[PDB]
Amino acid sequence: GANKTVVVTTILESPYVMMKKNHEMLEGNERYEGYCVDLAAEIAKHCGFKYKLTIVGDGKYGARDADTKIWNGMVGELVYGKADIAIAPLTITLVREEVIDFSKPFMSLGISIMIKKGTPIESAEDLSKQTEIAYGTLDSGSTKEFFRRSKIAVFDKMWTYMRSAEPSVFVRTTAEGVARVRKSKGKYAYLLESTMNEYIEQRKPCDTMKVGGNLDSKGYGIATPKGSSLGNAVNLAVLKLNEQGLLDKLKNKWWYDKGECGS
Amino acid sequence: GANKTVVVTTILESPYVMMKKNHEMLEGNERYEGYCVDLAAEIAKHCGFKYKLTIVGDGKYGARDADTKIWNGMVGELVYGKADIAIAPLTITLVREEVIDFSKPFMSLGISIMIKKGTPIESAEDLSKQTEIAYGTLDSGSTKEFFRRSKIAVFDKMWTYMRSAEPSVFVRTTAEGVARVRKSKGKYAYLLESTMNEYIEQRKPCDTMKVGGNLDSKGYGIATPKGSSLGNAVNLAVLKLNEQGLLDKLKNKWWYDKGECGS
Ligand SMILES: N[C@@H](CCC(=O)O)C(=O)O
Numbered sequence: 001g002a003n004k005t006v007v008v009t010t011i012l013e014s015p016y017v018m019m020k021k022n023h024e025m026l027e028g029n030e031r032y033e034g035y036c037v038d039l040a041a042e043i044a045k046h047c048g049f050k051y052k053l054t055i056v057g058d059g060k061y062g063a064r065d066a067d068t069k070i071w072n073g074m075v076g077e078l079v080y081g082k083a084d085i086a087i088a089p090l091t092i093t094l095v096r097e098e099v100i101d102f103s104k105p106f107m108s109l110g111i112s113i114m115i116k117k118g119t120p121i122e123s124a125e126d127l128s129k130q131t132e133i134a135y136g137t138l139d140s141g142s143t144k145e146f147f148r149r150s151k152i153a154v155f156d157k158m159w160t161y162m163r164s165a166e167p168s169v170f171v172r173t174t175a176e177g178v179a180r181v182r183k184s185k186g187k188y189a190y191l192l193e194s195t196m197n198e199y200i201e202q203r204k205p206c207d208t209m210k211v212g213g214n215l216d217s218k219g220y221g222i223a224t225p226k227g228s229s230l231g232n233a234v235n236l237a238v239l240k241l242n243e244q245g246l247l248d249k250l251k252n253k254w255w256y257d258k259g260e261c262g263s
Numbered sequence: 264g265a266n267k268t269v270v271v272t273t274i275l276e277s278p279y280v281m282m283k284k285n286h287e288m289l290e291g292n293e294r295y296e297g298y299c300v301d302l303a304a305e306i307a308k309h310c311g312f313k314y315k316l317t318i319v320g321d322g323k324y325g326a327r328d329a330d331t332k333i334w335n336g337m338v339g340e341l342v343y344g345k346a347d348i349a350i351a352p353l354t355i356t357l358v359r360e361e362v363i364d365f366s367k368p369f370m371s372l373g374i375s376i377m378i379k380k381g382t383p384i385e386s387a388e389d390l391s392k393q394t395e396i397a398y399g400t401l402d403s404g405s406t407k408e409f410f411r412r413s414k415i416a417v418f419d420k421m422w423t424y425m426r427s428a429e430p431s432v433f434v435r436t437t438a439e440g441v442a443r444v445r446k447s448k449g450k451y452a453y454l455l456e457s458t459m460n461e462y463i464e465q466r467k468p469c470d471t472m473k474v475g476g477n478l479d480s481k482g483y484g485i486a487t488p489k490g491s492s493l494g495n496a497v498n499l500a501v502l503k504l505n506e507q508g509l510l511d512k513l514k515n516k517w518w519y520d521k522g523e524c525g526s
């Protein structure tokens with residue numbers, strides 16, 4: 001077939017994809033900036049394709065409903081043919097690998113705890129052993145599924161609390177979770193990936209921090225629908241970019257070089 | 264085809280695969296113990312195959328000669344049909360992915376510096392800026408190739424020194440590198456993966472340590488020849504084991520639970 005513009009699905013999640021300050025006066029890919037915007041340009045160059053960035057319609061990463069077996073989020077967009085590739089902080093997981101393909105990781109990470117400074121919590125075990133401080137995760141993502149599935153004693157205890165907590169402890173976006181931490185006087189802690197936690201630590205008003213070790217070790221990958229003609233070349237491109245130090249340069253650029261909480 | 268015993272290639276590298284104390288009175292897979300021996304048993308169970316562990320004939324991880332284009336080590340055993348799968352601390356890299364397939368990572372790691380305690384070095388930049396302390400890497404592995412290929416200023420400077428150093432700074436096995444660190448009075452430092460560095464820190468006589476941050480971020484994967492009927496199921500198995508916490512349990516078991524340098 002003739003070369004065709006590749007539809008990239010991605011998600012508005014800082015600092016992966018953000019609206020440029022002057023985005024109103026801009027069009028197409030130029031509306032956006034961030035780690036994954038930089039990454040997409042590199043991947044496309046190396047794989048020889050043109051592309052259009054599109055923000056996922058429902059603003060979700062992607063989960064499958066247990067009853068209907070229907071997928072949402074970026075995973076759904078790939079599964080149902082609405083996008084050709086996902087270039088986003090999308091976690092490589094078993095249930096996703098059953099339906100789509102992933103490159104080798106472009107970033108390594110694990111689940112972690114965000115607190116408002118001063119909150120007397122230093123571990124997941126700490127959270128599990130008390131009830132004064134509420135805690136939750138993002139909806140329709142891999143962190144929620146981690147807790148739902150885990151048989152580890154501490155993590156299952158946390159799930160049991162989170163699933164039946166009222167008012168709901170789950171949030172629709174990472175930014176909503178961060179806002180909740182900031183305004184809840186230390187009575188809400190947020191479970192999120194170390195990458196996002198470390199970024200938010202670097203942002204004003206510098207009132208949050210990561211505590212504890214990571215709960216797991218996993219990775220983000222570039223995802224393609226099964227049968228895509230792009231998967232092999234994308235995988236090799238990710239590995240090249242990692243080996244040439246480009247991925248590390250992009251992390252430093254978006255996380256630390258312009259961190260707002262000092263040197 | 265009828266089910267057939269799967270030939271697993273692996274490498275004698277502590278604590279991944281080690282000879283059991285009483286190995287002389289034992290046969291087959293029972294001769295060996297370690298992280299990758301435990302991992303192989305889990306992978307085989309989940310994928311429904313029987314298997315034979317075999318130690319790589321030439322004792323190497325695997326590199327390709329630039330002139331002949333011939334592969335050695337475990338990669339060679341897969342490429343030439345001498346083994347069906349590699350279950351070992353084998354780094355996922357571009358040149359390897361061009362010829363064999365890898366599961367998603369079962370362990371995350373990066374290149375790091377091992378010193379004898381007291382050596383006045385705290386970073387790769389430190390090594391690069393002096394000449395009193397020699398330093399090197401393992402032959403025929405991914406760390407050597409990292410330095411050979413890197414255009415990062417510090418790393419290229421290190422390569423330039425290492426490639427022409429006399430007497431040779433390269434070693435045939437990790438154990439040889441560790442021994443060299445221990446007996447060289449602080450005048451040899453060793454570049455090796457953080458996983459192996461962290462293990463050796465935990466072993467008597469407790470005279471080495473890791474210094475500096477990791478130089479990169481990468482992963483070990485289970486490797487299969489292209490065209491193998493095992494690749495998909497192995498990949499899904501690795502992800503399941505990671506998500507169920509089994510991989511982390513195995514790391515703790517072999518690295519820390521019986522560390523010899525205290526709590
Ligand atoms: N990276 C996650 C979203 C963030 C989270 O779940 O913490 C995913 O791919 O679902």
Ligand SMILES: N[C@@H](CCC(=O)O)C(=O)O
Pocket residue numbers: 324325352353354401403404405406407454455456
């Ligand atoms: N894991 C490496 C061997 C160790 C090293 O090169 O430091 C490889 O797969 O080649």
